[PDB]
Structures are given as structure tokens and as C-alpha cells.
């Protein structure tokens, strides 16, 4: 963002010194300057590079993810999952909850992912090699048994689901009327928390086959990793709920 | 009133890690017997990792357990250490002195020899160059190259025999090497000589960074390499095309901030998960050095713009702006050495001006330069007493935000100013 | 609600079996907390191998107000050290 402002300031100071704005010796460059500041002003070049990379697209092991299926899901079991962001010295990166609303039923999923660089110390203790997958399995079983403790009947899953077949990308402004609103023959909604459960942050995206306050994604990568099985941080600015 | 905690018992073999949920509001002496049976002549107790054992009378509430912390299973602290007692003052000197690691041993000699050597090379080089710069006679360049070549070999000769002396001998090899090339076609300490040298260390460094079998000596190589490369171009273009009365630094401070602001990507440019710990530090070492290249560059020309007298009022703001920008660009850097480097940019530059005026016989800005250090030292102290102005948590969010537009509003807002000093658009 | 007895740190008792079948000896600690509407929580254990490395990160706190102190003095020391030299190297020419 700073490159844009610095180059803009460059050209404009370059043009303002055109007091002899004549002979097309100092007016010509003046025209080109005032012209470029317009095209430099940052929602147009972005789709330029986007389409370029998109048409180019027409041809790790630091992150493991565990995903939980619970049938009778509800916001009554929200604190139990926002707690598991940071406890037992394992610092889950982000916790994600997804529903498919194709037909009438909302097929629920919890998505838990653990990096390896910021909790390298703990994983280094379980063995000299790094038991990432096994450890993540263990925390997942812990969530399973604590959640069944409450009463909901949960199931570990690995062939989880698909919001993009393995098609409309929208990320919302922040609040509740919408998540009660969400159409078409298929609905994929995805909630995800992160950021220090001392006070958490979250981003939300949804996919179906502008309703109230949605926004499309020109340029899809954002749908490619909308499935829970994905190990990615769900691009988008965070909100303190 | 149950709380879910995870204890850790590792005394027998490796360790056993389970978790549980436990009834709060009790003396821990009641629940200790239970955990002793799950995970498993002394007494035991519970303690947070990083702290001291918890009393057997307090409760898991009044001792401050949050639901989900990781407790360890340590022992009750101690008893007395049972002090010895010896009456004959003679043996009171031999007995109570062993606890030193005093033995001479054939390893205090290993560190002995190498430390003697690194001194021999350094003053061996400096003598000849002093035999070469204050007077003139090339016999030094014979001796310079002689020792310079020799150390070149030795580092390559113990690469797989010492594994610590090697990397140490490499870093000192570049002092005479940079001295050697700097002596071809002398001049008056010369215009294009500084081109020959920046090739040398940038050569010698790059050969050895990949030559390092491990950590402990990587960061010093990386930083001086980019520093050699960086100065090479702005010296080369300065050798033929441009006369550049003053705008060598205008290239530098530009190049400087460019390297600092674009730092994370450059580190990545040098890039079973068992060897993750070895890869993660080297990555960090790369970043911590690369940033030093920035600061050292950032001043590198900045010490030359405001250096002489008769400078520009735009030149004075051309350096100050940079400093603050880098100083406020630290809050984005996580590690410690990363922070300190850019943080003390002003400090390093402050003394540069002082010597400049004392060696330039000014005795005017010198005193001021010394008054421009205290102001920077004074703020360091008040940053240390109360962890309040150092901690951005007791702030306001738009304040946390305003400093943002404050940051990017100035670190880049000097390229228009840059066009003024040189007058790039006065043509 | 459903309150019942439980040995400490374990799942509550089964309501229709006597304590003498689960193995209650005279002198245990039993808790009147609710009944699990689900699993009895077999408390999965994972093995640990190098428990020393867990503490060594606990002591190794972050940047913190500790690295400020080293920067504090190491700043102050150099300030004095140039302070004298400046004044007397001012005098190494004139004064």
C-alpha cells in the first residue's frame, strides 16, 4: 500500500513543478503524470494481476488437521470449542465450523489445525522425530470425549465433505440476520475462530451453487480451501466479534 | 466445581502424559493420592511448568489454576543441604575449592592456541597496511596476500575436524582478504578499489555460508555478504557513469530502507520433517543478519549526507525521517536481536556525526551530537523501569492504528524529498 | 439433574451396582457430581520422552522486560565512555 502512495507522491510532485505548462516540453509529461495518478488509484490493478495469475492457474507437513462430525450441532456447544484454541500447551492455530445446508439438513463439522513452528518445543518432547499427526489425533479424541461428555454424539471423520466438488465465493461484513438468512440447491457455510481465546477473533465465508451484505471474490483460490480437510488460514481480515 | 487439567509425570522412563478433570475447592493433599495411581522414599506434589511446587494446603482455585493448564508432578522442594564442617584451616582451602572446574586439562590449551592465532593474523595484516597507507611500499601486499591466502586454506582444511574452529577461522579470513584486493591500483586509497573489495568479501562469504555444516556463524556471513553486494553496485555505477557529488548515499539510504522494508521475503529467498529444528533457526539467523545489512546500509550513506558542512535543510530531514521510520518498523519484528538492530539505528548514527565533527574540527555540532545521544538514552531508561510505555497493551486501538498510518506515512514519504536533494526533477 | 458418587478423578459410579462390586474400600473419597450422559472418559495417555525440553522453554520467556535491561545499561555504559573521551579528546587538541 506504501508503494502506491510513494509512487503517487513522486509523480504529483513531479507534475506540480510544471509552471511552464507549455511547449509540450513540460506539459506533455504533465499530462502523463496526472494521467497515471488516476490509474494508480488500488482496486483495479489488483484484478489485473488476479486474472493473470488465474489464467496461469488454468494448468508442507507443518500443518495437520482433524475434523469432527457431530449431528445435532448447536451454538450451545460453542465455548467448548473456542476453549480448545489454547490449552495443554498445544496452541491450535484456528478452529473452524462448517455446515452444508443442501436440502433441509445442516451437516456439521469442526475443523482443528495445529502448526509446528510455534509449538515446536512441545512436539519435540513426545519424540525426537515430530509426531504431528498422532498428537493431533490425541487432541481430537479429547474433544470427542469431552463433547460426548456433554451429550452430543460425535464422530471422527477423514473423508469429510466437499463445498467445492473434488460455486459462489462470498465473505461477509460484520451479523446474525445473515447467518439466519443463508438461495439455491446447495449451501456451504463455514465459521472459523482464531486468535488467542483470551479474546478470540474470527472470519466467515460461505458458498452456494449479493443477497444482503455479501461480496464476491474476483480471482477460485478462496473456494479451493473452504473444505474442512484443508490446512489453510482462511484469508480475510479478522474481527473481535 | 470440577476443572480439567493435564499433569505430567516423567521420572521413570521418558514420560507419561495424561489429562483429567479434578474437583476444585480442596487441599491438594487430598487429590494427590489419586493422580499418583493413574500416571505412576520421597514426597510429591503439583507445579506449573516453570514455577515452584504448590503448597499442599491451598486449593486449585486460590493457587490460580485456569481450566486447561499443564501442571507437572514435581517433588516437595527440599530440606537443608546439610552443610559440611572442616576445622583444619589448611584443608579448608583444598576442600571448598574443587567446585570450580579449575583443571588445566588439554582443552584449555586448544582454546589457547586458536585465540593466539587470530591475533597473529589480525596484527599481521594491519602492520603491512600501516606499512602501506601512511607510508608507501608494496612489500606489504606481498605479506598481505601471503597471510590472506594462508588463512583461506586453513578454514577449508579443518572443515570436518574441529567444526567450531573452522567457522571461526572463516570469519576472520575476510579481514586480510578485503585488505588484499583493496591494494590493486591504489590511487589515493582509490576510487575503483572499493569496487574490487566488495567483490572479494561477497565472494569469500558466499563460498562459506554454504560451507557451514551447522549454525553458529551463519548470521555474520549473511549480513556482510548482502552488505558487500549492496555496496558493490552503488560503487560500480559510481565508478563510471555518475560523478555523484553527494548522491551516493541517496542511492544507499534508498537501497537501505528498501532492504529493511523488504526483509521477510529475502530470507525466504535463501531457502521427513525431523530436521525441522535445524531448518527453523537457520531461517531465523538469515533474517536477523539481513536486517543488520539494512541498518548498516541505512547509515552507510546517511553518515555521508549530513557529514560535511554546507549541507541541505532537506538533507537533515532526509536522514531523521529514515531513522524514525525504521525505529517504528520494529514493532513488527518478533525476536529480540531482530528488534535491537533497527532500534539502535539512531544510536549508531549519533556517534558517527560526533567523530565526523571532531575529526572534521567542528566543535559545534559535536556537543549537540552528544546531547542527541542522552535524549535517546533517557528514553531507553524510562522504557525499562515501568513496562508500560514499552508494552503496547495499555494503549488505545486507534493509537495502535494511528501509529500505523504514522509508520507508512513517513518511511516512504521521502522519495519525493529524495527528488529534491539531488534535484532529480530540476532537470 | 442427576447427582451420584464418584472416586476422585474418575467417572461417576454406576447407579444400579453396589459400591462393593466396583471396589470401594473403607476410607475412599467420593464426589457428588453429575452423571455422564455419554462416555466414561478413559483419559487417553500419550507417552513423553524428553520432559526436560518442556521446562527449558518455560524458563525461556519471550523478549519481555528482561532484554530491555541489557539494552538499558549497555546503552548507558557507552554513553559515559564516549562522554569522557569526547571531552578529553576535545582536550587532546585544545581546551
From Swiss-Prot, chain A:
<keyword id="KW-0997">Cell inner membrane</keyword>
<feature type="transmembrane region" description="Helical">
    <location>
        <begin position="29"/>
        <end position="44"/>
    </location>
</feature>
<dbReference type="InterPro" id="IPR050051">
    <property type="entry name" value="EccE_dom"/>
</dbReference>
<keyword id="KW-0472">Membrane</keyword>
<dbReference type="GO" id="GO:0005886">
    <property type="term" value="C:plasma membrane"/>
</dbReference>
<keyword id="KW-0813">Transport</keyword>
<keyword id="KW-1133">Transmembrane helix</keyword>
<protein>
    <recommendedName>
        <fullName>ESX-3 secretion system protein EccE3</fullName>
    </recommendedName>
</protein>
<comment type="similarity">
    <text>Belongs to the EccE family.</text>
</comment>
<dbReference type="InterPro" id="IPR021368">
    <property type="entry name" value="T7SS_EccE"/>
</dbReference>
<feature type="transmembrane region" description="Helical">
    <location>
        <begin position="5"/>
        <end position="25"/>
    </location>
</feature>
<comment type="subunit">
    <text>Part of the ESX-3 / type VII secretion system (T7SS), which is composed of cytosolic and membrane components. The ESX-3 membrane complex is composed of EccB3, EccC3, EccD3 and EccE3.</text>
</comment>
<dbReference type="Pfam" id="PF11203">
    <property type="entry name" value="EccE"/>
</dbReference>
<comment type="function">
    <text>Part of the ESX-3 specialized secretion system, which is required for siderophore-mediated iron acquisition and for the secretion of EsxH and EsxG.</text>
</comment>
<keyword id="KW-0812">Transmembrane</keyword>
From Swiss-Prot, chain B:
<feature type="transmembrane region" description="Helical">
    <location>
        <begin position="163"/>
        <end position="183"/>
    </location>
</feature>
<feature type="transmembrane region" description="Helical">
    <location>
        <begin position="310"/>
        <end position="330"/>
    </location>
</feature>
<dbReference type="InterPro" id="IPR024962">
    <property type="entry name" value="YukD-like"/>
</dbReference>
<comment type="function">
    <text>Part of the ESX-3 specialized secretion system, which is required for siderophore-mediated iron acquisition and for the secretion of EsxH and EsxG.</text>
</comment>
<keyword id="KW-1133">Transmembrane helix</keyword>
<feature type="transmembrane region" description="Helical">
    <location>
        <begin position="138"/>
        <end position="158"/>
    </location>
</feature>
<feature type="transmembrane region" description="Helical">
    <location>
        <begin position="365"/>
        <end position="385"/>
    </location>
</feature>
<feature type="transmembrane region" description="Helical">
    <location>
        <begin position="218"/>
        <end position="238"/>
    </location>
</feature>
<comment type="similarity">
    <text>Belongs to the EccD/Snm4 family.</text>
</comment>
<feature type="transmembrane region" description="Helical">
    <location>
        <begin position="109"/>
        <end position="129"/>
    </location>
</feature>
<feature type="transmembrane region" description="Helical">
    <location>
        <begin position="289"/>
        <end position="309"/>
    </location>
</feature>
<feature type="transmembrane region" description="Helical">
    <location>
        <begin position="189"/>
        <end position="209"/>
    </location>
</feature>
<keyword id="KW-0472">Membrane</keyword>
<feature type="transmembrane region" description="Helical">
    <location>
        <begin position="340"/>
        <end position="360"/>
    </location>
</feature>
<dbReference type="InterPro" id="IPR006707">
    <property type="entry name" value="T7SS_EccD"/>
</dbReference>
Swiss-Prot record, chain C:
<comment type="similarity">
    <text>Belongs to the EccD/Snm4 family.</text>
</comment>
<comment type="function">
    <text>Part of the ESX-3 specialized secretion system, which is required for siderophore-mediated iron acquisition and for the secretion of EsxH and EsxG.</text>
</comment>
<protein>
    <recommendedName>
        <fullName>ESX-3 secretion system protein EccD3</fullName>
    </recommendedName>
</protein>
<feature type="transmembrane region" description="Helical">
    <location>
        <begin position="68"/>
        <end position="88"/>
    </location>
</feature>
<comment type="subunit">
    <text>Part of the ESX-3 / type VII secretion system (T7SS), which is composed of cytosolic and membrane components. The ESX-3 membrane complex is composed of EccB3, EccC3, EccD3 and EccE3.</text>
</comment>
Amino acid at each position: 500500500m506504501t508503494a502506491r502512495i510513494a509512487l503517487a507522491s513522486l509523480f504529483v510532485v513531479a507534475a506540480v513543478l510544471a509552471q511552464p505548462w507549455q511547449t509540450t516540453t513540460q506539459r506533455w509529461v504533465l499530462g502523463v503524470s496526472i494521467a497515471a495518478v488516476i490509474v494508480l488509484l488500488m482496486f483495479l490493478t489488483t484484478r489485473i494481476g488476479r486474472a493473470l495469475a488465474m489464467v496461469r492457474r488454468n494448468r508442507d507437513a507443518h500443518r495437520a488437521t482433524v475434523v469432527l462430525r457431530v449431528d445435532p450441532a448447536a451454538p450451545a456447544q460453542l465455548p467448548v470449542v473456542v476453549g480448545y484454541l489454547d490449552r495443554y500447551g498445544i496452541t491450535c492455530d484456528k478452529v473452524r465450523i462448517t455446515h452444508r445446508d443442501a436440502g433441509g439438513t445442516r451437516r456439521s463439522w469442526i475443523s482443528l489445525t495445529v502448526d509446528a513452528v510455534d509449538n515446536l518445543a512441545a512436539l519435540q518432547a513426545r519424540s525426537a522425530r515430530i509426531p504431528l499427526q498422532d498428537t493431533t489425533e490425541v487432541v481430537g479424541r479429547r474433544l470427542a470425549d469431552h463433547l460426548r461428555e456433554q451429550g452430543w454424539t460425535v464422530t471422527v471423520v477423514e473423508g469429510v465433505d466437499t463445498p467445492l466438488p473434488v460455486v459462489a465465493a462470498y465473505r461477509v461484513k460484520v451479523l446474525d440476520e445473515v447467518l439466519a438468512e443463508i438461495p439455491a440447491e446447495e449451501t456451504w457455510t463455514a465459521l472459523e475462530f482464531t486468535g488467542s481465546p483470551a479474546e478470540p477473533l474470527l472470519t466467515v465465508c460461505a458458498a452456494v451453487r449479493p443477497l444482503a451484505g455479501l461480496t464476491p471474490a474476483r480471482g477460485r483460490p478462496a473456494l479451493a480451501a473452504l473444505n474442512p480437510l484443508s490446512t489453510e488460514r482462511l484469508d480475510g481480515t479478522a474481527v473481535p466479534l | 466445581p470440577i476443572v480439567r487439567v493435564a499433569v505430567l509425570a516423567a521420572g521413570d522412563d521418558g514420560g507419561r502424559l495424561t489429562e483429567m478433570a479434578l474437583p476444585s475447592e480442596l487441599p491438594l493433599r487430598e487429590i494427590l493420592p489419586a493422580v499418583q495411581r493413574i500416571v505412576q522414599p520421597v514426597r510429591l506434589s503439583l507445579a506449573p511448568i516453570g514455577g515452584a511446587p504448590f503448597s499442599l494446603d491451598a486449593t486449585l482455585d486460590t493457587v490460580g489454576v485456569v481450566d486447561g493448564d499443564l501442571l507437572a508432578l514435581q517433588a516437595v522442594p527440599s530440606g537443608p543441604p546439610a552443610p559440611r564442617i572442616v576445622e583444619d584451616i589448611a584443608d579448608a582451602a583444598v576442600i571448598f575449592s574443587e567446585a570450580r572446574r579449575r583443571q588445566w586439562g588439554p582443552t584449555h590449551i586448544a582454546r589457547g592456541a586458536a585465540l593466539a592465532l587470530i591475533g597473529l593474523i589480525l596484527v599481521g595484516t594491519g602492520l603491512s597496511v600501516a606499512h602501506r597507507v601512511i607510508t608507501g611500499d608494496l612489500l606489504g601486499q606481498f605479506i598481505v596476500s601471503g597471510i590472506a591466502l594462508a588463512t583461506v586454506i586453513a578454514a577449508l582444511a579443518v572443515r570436518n575436524r574441529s567444526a567450531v574452529l573452522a567457522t571461526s577461522l572463516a570469519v576472520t579470513a575476510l579481514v586480510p582478504v578485503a585488505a588484499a584486493f583493496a591494494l590493486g591500483v591504489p590511487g589515493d586509497f582509490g576510487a575503483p578499489n572499493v569496487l574490487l573489495a566488495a567483490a572479494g568479501v561477497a565472494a569469500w562469504s558466499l563460498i562459506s555460508m554454504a560451507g557451514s555444516p551447522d549454525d553458529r556463524g551463519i548470521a555474520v556471513f549473511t549480513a556482510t555478504a548482502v552488505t558487500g553486494v549492496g555496496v558493490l553496485l552503488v560503487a560500480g555505477a559510481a565508478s563510471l557513469w555518475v560523478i555523484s557529488s553527494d548522491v551516493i548515499g541517496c542511492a544507499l539510504v534508498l537501497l537501505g530502507l528498501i532492504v529493511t522494508v523488504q526483509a521477510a521475503q529475502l530470507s525466504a529467498m535463501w531457502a521427513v520433517l525431523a530436521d525441522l529444528p535445524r531448518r527453523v533457526r537457520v531461517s531465523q539467523a538469515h533474517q536477523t543478519g539481513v536486517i543488520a545489512a539494512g541498518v548498516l546500509l541505512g547509515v552507510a550513506g546517511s553518515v555521508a549526507l549530513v557529514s560535511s558542512a554546507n549541507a541541505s535543510p532537506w538533507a537533515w530531514y532526509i536522514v531523521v525521517a529514515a531513522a524514525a521510520g525504521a525505529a517504528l518498523r520494529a514493532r513488527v519484528w518478533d525476536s529480540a536481536a531482530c528488534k535491537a538492530w533497527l532500534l539502535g539505528h539512531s544510536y549508531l548514527l549519533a556517534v558517527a556525526l560526533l567523530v565526523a565533527f571532531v575529526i572534521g574540527d567542528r566543535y559545534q555540532a559535536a556537543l549537540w551530537a552528544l546531547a542527541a545521544l542522552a535524549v535517546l538514552v533517557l528514553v531507553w531508561i524510562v522504557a525499562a523501569l515501568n513496562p508500560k510505555i514499552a508494552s503496547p497493551d495499555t494503549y488505545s486501538l486507534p493509537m495502535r492504528r494511528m501509529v500505523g498510518f504514522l509508520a507508512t506515512g513517513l518511511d516512504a514519504s521521502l522519495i519525493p524529498v529524495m527528488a529534491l536533494l539531488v534535484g532529480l526533477f530540476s532537470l
